[PDB]
Design a binder for this molecule. Structure first.
Ligand SMILES: [Ca+2]
Ligand SMILES: [Ca+2]
Ligand SMILES: [Ca+2]
Ligand SMILES: [Ca+2]
Ligand SMILES: [Ca+2]
Ligand SMILES: [Ca+2]
Ligand SMILES: [Ca+2]
Lengths: 321, 286, 286, 321
């Protein structure tokens, strides 16, 4: 069949393009009849690796997100709400898969790694990425793999909250691109799953609570974490980590009518915007992200207390009549 | 790619008290047995800084003695499993520890340490429950002396299993003082704290050996180089510009606590330095 | 009381040159396998620095791909048992070597390195017969390309046996320029050469990554910070005093050859610096 | 596996690129226990075929170099110094190998041939190259071969010298490129070796001696031949055929201080340059070629006698102190 030319048995072919074909990953639960507790193995997708001539990591996004715990609503788009009737998690297999949309003529580097410290900070440069134990180094166009070192320790989910994210999380996951020529798309990576659900509980809420200090930095958290809400002395920051349709509820301290800006992949849905000028205010809004960078920001003055809540929601109303 | 280390690192020179002193008659569980402890392990420092899980197999306290059969005191090495509990108050407390030893100063002593094989994490990301990650605490305690002179120099018998490797940590230290402030960033380890007082700096050692110092600061006012305690100055270079800020490189070599140094200056309105252990290495023009 | 090590370290980025080139067309058997070679081994940097003998078990060269199926060239990895013989002049010398591999640039390539079990010494005291101490030489060679762009990223398949425990071995580099002169001391390793020209400095990289730079010099004349090639400046701080000498701390991050930097100044009458690999770490006031 | 598209069994694939992978050729000697004389079979590389829109042959280089005798220091970079303890040569296999650095989109012709007359002159054009008995005709990007007709005649090496280069040499070797678009590189050719060493002698020196007549053309030779040293009425020519680090020794008749020029791949090493103006002069120099065209020339006047010697050498000194 195939006739390929200029080839004598034992020779190399670098083709114009390559592609694998990906299908319906329909999960299987297994009954580990135990404490009458469950086990799940399904395939959840994870992000579209775009290029970075320069040197970027999960989107140039920072605050080890990525985090291998399930939920990571940030990471795992389906497991979201099962390990949600449960309290202890434990994997058996997790494998990074890297397919490629681009073609044998893009010019760059992608790279998947694994840090056992859910908390150490991120890759600085070339020489650092490469020193990791569990790493892989691929041109972008060519097809790649990574399998992850799983213990069987009895590890806890984030339902109550826990600052030592390391003693509870399994690992960190990296994806890193340098040496590109443009920050376009070349890769879409997947997630090979297998998890052991344990002491199943009243089901935890997935709702987000995020306080800015009055002049300050940061008050409480509950998370998960889709959002960070910073202030700058005038003006807020609502910096997305998550994608989809959300629902936003809250307001803040200002005095000064709200001007609703945002930036990147964004589909505003319902912006409602009470103020009282002199005092504080409220915002409900409903938006829908499908990118990074998605940003939004409220524009205001004298941002002297920041409060919000975020808890994923449909094309759902959020405005008066 | 899992490395095993069994070495013998030096640790501190114990001075007496009449009174009742611990790990320097200093405080905040200094000695924590984790490697790094830049404070405790002067050698293991930048090996396990390429790794993420640590686990010992042997650790033994060794106590030799420089003094003579006529000093009058107590040395005492112990072991708290809670990297975090606070320190020895008095006589009756020190003695109640499981893994303790009670020796005169002149006489020669030992202690071996109870090691589990739990998969414990090193301090690259930070972790307030220093107990769930640290192996143990280490004590050394002296009461009943007659003078706070030196009688003992203690060592560290090592055996460690390094695991998942990625990125040496930072054998190199970065330490920012706010302009008027307190404290900017850190990278550490931490050998040094660099405080200011409104005039004048503080470089307060936690570490021992030959270092290398690089930096300068905001002042206006020529640098007068003082320091205090065990200290062997090596190279002090000292650019200023009076009116503005300045720079200091220097190379010194500590073998004590208390080692202090301080720069003397005025209007200390920004503090920056870096410290990353170094030899008898130059640090001055020609 | 000995160590063993098996990890994987990155090495340099193979660019292209239709000409015929060898390690960047730098010369003086740089790639030598010995560990340290700070130029070659970015990670083991600091284990074989606590040791005195070394011995490899595996060494494998790994060649992945930055370019694309239409890049147009030749790459080539080899191995000389004489840490000292000179480099490849042309195509025909390279091809005659025992341990060679010859690949497109675009396609992914391999090489295994031949290991003895001889008790070989590391470079702490110095040794002009670099051959009887070093295991082999490493080549990477590119000819017949069409542009001097990047095609390859080369790695290091490692497995090393450390023996008798040392007392550290500086990993902060010390590099003195004579007043009018050429060259004062060294400590090295060597990532950098610091030359002067009558006006102006040269900081010529041999190494890749995040460094930390500390020092200043003799001039009189405010500092203008240039550099050339793969370079990501991080923190440039720059005291001067005009009339006199000056200081520079800076933090940069190279991933190429050619990386250059140079300070621009006048009356370069003494050159001093130190360099000791460092993170994204601060190096400036506040 | 491979899925290649638009193909029904029996169809043709002309790929984006092809490459073979070449390794360490580590020679074997065989003991033909004879007159206690030796046999060698190893793989020596030979040149990088660059393109020639126009019509070029071993570099547009002329004076059948190329010559199949071993040594040919010009041709065989290793066999250089064994058939050097010997006096009779005889092959059994010699095969031209043509791999390719370029890609399936360069646009040209390469071509390997074989003339039984070590001495006939070179290919003029298209119609001439093709008429040879032992020739091969390849696009450049595609992968090629040629095997060579070996007799077993008892043929002599060039240790004493011999003007009928034909009665001693096995063959001529050609490589020819026409129809390009640029004189860049597409090919690197190799040499499949197998030689029978005979009456082994005191080992001959490899040193070159090259006399220009006073007004003339040409005095003696010893060779091998790496160099030709011509004059033009003013000025010399040192025209390389060889690559590497050499050592040059000599001077000449002029009167007129030496200006050292040269052209192409060249790394000058040590130029020393006595003159006496009025009279003659001397030059030692040490240079290092890795190309064709390498040229050098000395610039001078009244070039009334040319003498030199050349005998391959290291980064070795060649100047006073
Ligand atoms: Ca829980
Ligand atoms: Ca880590
Ligand atoms: Ca860590
Ligand atoms: Ca050699
Ligand atoms: Ca040594
Ligand atoms: Ca030693
Ligand atoms: Ca003969």
């Amino acid at each position: 069949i195939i006739t390929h030319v200029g080839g004598v048995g034992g020779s190399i072919m670098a083709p114009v393009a390559v592609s694998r074909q990906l299908v319906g990953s329909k999960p299987k639960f297994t009954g580990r009849t135990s404490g009458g507790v469950t086990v799940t193995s399904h395939r959840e997708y994870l992000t579209q690796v775009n290029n970075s001539s320069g040197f970027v990591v999960n989107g140039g996004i920072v605050g080890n997100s990525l985090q291998l715990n399930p939920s990571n609503g940030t990471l795992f788009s389906w497991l979201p709400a099962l390990a949600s009737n449960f309290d202890q998690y434990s994997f058996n297999s997790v494998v990074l898969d890297y397919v490629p949309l681009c073609g044998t003529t893009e010019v760059g580097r992608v790279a998947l790694y694994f840090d056992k410290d859910s908390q150490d900070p991120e890759p600085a440069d070339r020489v650092e990425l490469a020193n990791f134990g569990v790493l892989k180094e691929t041109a972008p166009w060519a097809e790649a793999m990574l399998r992850i070192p799983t213990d069987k320790v009895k590890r806890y989910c984030n339902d109550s909250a826990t600052v030592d994210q390391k003693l509870i999380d399994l690992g960190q996951l990296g994806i890193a691109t340098y040496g590109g020529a443009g920050a376009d798309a070349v890769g879409e990576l997947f997630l090979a799953r297998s998890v052991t659900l344990y002491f199943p509980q009243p089901t935890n809420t997935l709702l987000s609570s995020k306080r800015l200090d009055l002049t300050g930095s940061l008050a409480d958290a509950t998370g998960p974490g889709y959002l960070v809400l910073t202030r700058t002395p005038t003006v807020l920051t609502h910096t997305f980590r998550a994608t989809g349709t959300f629902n936003l509820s809250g307001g803040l301290r200002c005095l000064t009518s709200l001007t609703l800006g945002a930036t990147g992949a964004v589909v505003i849905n319902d912006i409602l915007a009470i103020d009282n000028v002199g005092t504080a205010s409220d915002y409900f809004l409903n938006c829908t992200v499908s990118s990074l960078p998605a940003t939004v920001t409220f524009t205001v003055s004298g941002v002297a207390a920041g409060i919000l809540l975020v808890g994923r929601a449909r094309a759902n109303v959020v405005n008066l009549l």
